[PDB]
Write a protein that binds this ligand. Structure first.
Ligand SMILES: Nc1ncnc2c1ncn2[C@@H]1O[C@H](COP(=O)(O)OP(=O)(O)O)[C@@H](O)[C@H]1O
Ligand SMILES: [Mg+2]
Lengths: 52, 212, 532
């Protein structure tokens, strides 16, 4: 259910077979890091996207 | 006497509170009672073979553990029975014993359950009084020793009158073999004794790194 | 009229009920605050015994019904998770704040005004703490860390032996120090393996300059001591290779069954030979090892350890330089195991600890690790030592990360109370009452400390308040901000020169959390309890 949201946010196009997995279907991003919430859990953020 | 067609209409919707007050208590009542219908009524109505290894089985079953040997859990009330039975998962196997004081056979198999729980940590051995369970008084005469086994809401063991099938002096080996040959007792595993304990917790993943 | 199947409480009744629940939770642990606090102990229904002093542990063990009481319990849990210390003071402060706020509300003061006053008071208290009551640890040196650890371990089972336990804690924390990007030193606590074992006294607790495993060698054949250890860390089992679910063996020519059966274990034999041919001495795996592979390791004079915990193996691999291997597959599609992925250590032994054995990986190279073995009188005592040790480690981590500390013994609370009492007159018309009540509720900490020591709480708190008032009103006697409470003699004392410190983050986070919890509870003025 999150595929549409992820694709809209980043710009990646889903790949269902390795034959069509090409560079044009990748969403560029300036930073993709996993941050620590002061010991309350690990949160993963992708901040900064080409063509947001 | 006429007007048989009544159509009580507004009445029941104006008295929902009290009717539901009765209904919740009745729901608790027959949920508890039906949790023991599936056992009641119908049960009561219805030279290697010389066990050379039995003695040495008892011999290394004597070494229970280091920190004491605990005891068998006791259920206080039927509501307690229900709220300890609906919890946990399917993988947990539960054996429950109904008993009364003074009658023959209870102490021996109670000690058997104690040592089994000592050397079968996975199982959840527990015992409950016949008065507490509120079973039919026919059980209260002629169905006290009942090695009852539950597994996640459904019966997996159907054993009553265990005195006839085991005796009165039967030890841990006898009941353990009788339970395992019905495919109930899980396979044992090689378990060792650590110093005391190691795992305080595992919640934070800040462990190590060597960034320049 | 409502016709709702449940019970409804409205107005002052529900507010009084919430205050009662919060006060009950506070009074549960109010007797376990400060060095004169005494530990509690809990017995479960089955019969398990837990002797403890930590407020968070006590509140976790208890089963609680009232929602506000659950709120305070979860507040203590949050304070434990995000800070590690002060889990009792936060609960006490939150309950006192709720009680005083409800007392204000009962006087027809609107709850919104009280909430705004509490918010402003918390903000100004944090600002004043950060501006006046912080002491930099740069000029104090290692003595600051030692004093912080000693203060944290006071009121615990290891309080009197603090002179040695603080040294052990500081050494353990400094051992696991690492720097990351942005050039910020980091101290990953919980990477220090805490091992418990009853036996000798507390003073025999050992700090390991390496790592400690609660595991033994799989077979008695292998040696129990290797000098120049070449640790190989694997994340897969060493057993007979059974084919996957999608592969089925069907035999039509009987002459090949023996070859199939032989290869079924020759695969594992070849894998172990590849692993051993590189010179490895110690092999650690998270999976199981059966008898054939154990014999293979025995014949080569190596060590094989099975069922190693994943976190322990990760820590060992990171410390010794080894790399975790799920499979022995390289980028060329074959089976290889190079020597570049072998870990190293100066000694690996299997010490005997009170009729039990554990593996010690001593003096790992390429990274320094640490572990602590706690020796106590029995299991309960060892558990309490472990909890207190974790509290001390968290306190030292907070001190080393943020280099600001504040005096202990209620000095911060008294200073904040005086400052807020003075400052409330300059803000609003009805918010000033809320700020004054915030200042008064901040005084519950020194009052509880004095009470637990059977000292005259009223006179001690009056003297503390007089000292802090004179400090704030006289610009030439600012040195009195450090006047705390000396519970041994029941007199005020300069805590800064007495080595009674604690991280500023503890006070700031506790204040913020307690204020927000009190605000959350204060908003409720009606309860609907639907019948199950
Ligand atoms: N040696 C000491 N002298 C005076 N006060 C102390 C001393 N050690 C600790 N305290 C104070 O006792 C208070 C209670 O701390 P404690 O209850 O042990 O922490 P927690 O609240 O995490 O359980 C702390 O606020 C601290 O300022
Ligand atoms: Mg503390």
């Amino acid at each position: 259910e999150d595929i549409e949201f992820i694709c809209k946010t980043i710009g990646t196009k889903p790949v269902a077979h390795i034959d069509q997995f090409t560079a044009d279907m990748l969403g560029s991003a300036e930073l993709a890091e996993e941050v620590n919430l002061n010991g309350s859990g690990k949160l993963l953020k992708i901040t900064g996207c080409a063509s947001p | 006497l006429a007007g048989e067609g009544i159509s009580v209409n507004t009445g029941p919707k104006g008295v929902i509170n009290d009717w539901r007050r009765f209904k919740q208590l009745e729901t608790e009542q027959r949920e508890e009672q039906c949790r023991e219908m599936e056992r009641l009524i119908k049960k009561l109505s219805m030279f290697l073979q010389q066990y050379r290894k039995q003695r040495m089985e008892e011999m290394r079953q004597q070494l229970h553990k280091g920190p004491q040997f605990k005891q068998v859990f006791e259920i206080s009330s039927g509501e307690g029975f229900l709220d300890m039975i609906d919890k946990e998962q399917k993988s947990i196997v539960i054996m429950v014993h109904i008993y009364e004081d003074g009658i023959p056979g209870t102490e021996a198999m109670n000690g058997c359950m104690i040592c089994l729980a000592a050397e079968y940590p996975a199982v959840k051995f527990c015992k409950v009084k016949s008065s507490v369970i509120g079973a039919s008084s026919q059980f209260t005469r002629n169905a006290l020793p009942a090695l009852l086994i539950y597994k996640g809401g459904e019966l997996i063991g159907n054993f009553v009158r265990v005195t006839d099938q085991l005796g009165d002096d039967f030890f841990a080996v006898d009941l353990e073999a009788f339970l395992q040959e019905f495919g109930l007792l899980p396979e044992k595993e090689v378990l060792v004794l650590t110093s005391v304990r190691n795992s305080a917790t595992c919640h934070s993943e800040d462990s190590d790194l060597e960034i320049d | 009229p409502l016709s709702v199947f449940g019970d409804r409480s409205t107005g002052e009744t529900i507010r009084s009920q919430n205050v009662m629940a919060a006060a009950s939770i506070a009074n549960i642990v109010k007797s376990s605050l400060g060095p004169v606090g005494l530990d509690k102990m809990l017995v479960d229904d089955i019969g398990d015994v837990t002797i403890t002093n930590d407020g968070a542990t006590i509140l976790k063990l208890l089963e609680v019904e009232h929602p506000a009481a659950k709120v305070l319990c979860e507040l203590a849990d949050l304070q434990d998770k995000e800070v590690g210390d002060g889990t009792t003071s936060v609960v006490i402060i939150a309950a006192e704040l709720l009680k005083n706020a409800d007392e204000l509300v009962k006087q027809k003061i609107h709850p919104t005004s009280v909430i705004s006053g509490y918010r402003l008071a918390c903000k100004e208290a944090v600002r004043y703490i950060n501006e006046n009551l912080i002491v930099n640890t740069d000029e104090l040196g290692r003595d600051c860390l030692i004093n912080a650890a000693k203060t944290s371990m006071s009121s615990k089972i290891i309080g009197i032996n603090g002179d040695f336990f603080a040294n052990m804690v500081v050494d353990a924390v400094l051992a696991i120090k690492y720097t990351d990007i942005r050039g910020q030193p980091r101290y990953p606590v919980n990477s220090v393996n805490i091992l418990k074992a009853h036996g000798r006294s507390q003073m025999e607790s050992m700090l390991i300059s390496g790592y400690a495993l609660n595991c033994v060698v799989g077979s008695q054949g292998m040696p129990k001591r290797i000098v120049n250890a070449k640790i190989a860390c694997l994340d897969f089992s060493l057993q007979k290779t059974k084919m996957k679910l999608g592969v089925q063996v069907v035999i039509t020519d009987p002459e090949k069954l023996d070859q199939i059966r032989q290869r079924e274990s020759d695969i594992t034999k070849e894998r172990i030979q590849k692993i051993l041919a590189t010179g490895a001495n110690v092999i650690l795996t998270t999976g199981g090892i059966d008898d054939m592979c154990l014999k293979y390791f025995v014949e080569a004079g190596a060590m094989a350890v099975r069922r190693v915990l994943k976190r322990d193996l990760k820590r060992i691999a990171k410390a010794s330089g080894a790399t975790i291997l799920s499979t022995l597959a390289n980028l060329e599609g074959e089976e290889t195991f190079e020597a570049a992925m072998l870990g190293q250590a100066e000694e690996v032994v299997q010490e005997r600890i009170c009729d039990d054995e554990l593996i010690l990986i001593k003096n790992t190279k390429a990274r320094t690790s640490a572990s602590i073995i706690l020796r106590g009188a029995n299991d309960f005592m060892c558990d309490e030592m472990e909890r207190s040790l974790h509290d001390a480690l968290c306190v030292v981590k907070r001190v080393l990360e943020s280099k600001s500390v504040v005096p202990g013994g209620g000095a911060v609370e008294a200073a904040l109370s005086i400052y807020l009492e003075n400052y409330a007159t300059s803000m609003g018309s009805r918010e000033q009452l809320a700020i004054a009540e915030f200042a008064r509720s901040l005084l519950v900490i020194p009052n509880t400390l004095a009470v637990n020591a059977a000292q005259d709480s009223t006179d001690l708190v009056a003297k503390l308040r007089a000292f802090h008032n004179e400090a704030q009103v006289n610009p030439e006697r600012k040195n009195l901000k450090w006047i705390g409470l000396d519970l041994s003699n029941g007199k005020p004392r300069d805590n800064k020169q007495a080595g009674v410190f604690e991280p500023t983050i503890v006070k700031v986070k506790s204040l913020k959390f307690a204020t927000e919890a009190a605000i959350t509870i204060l908003r409720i003025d009606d309860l609907i309890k639907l019948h199950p």
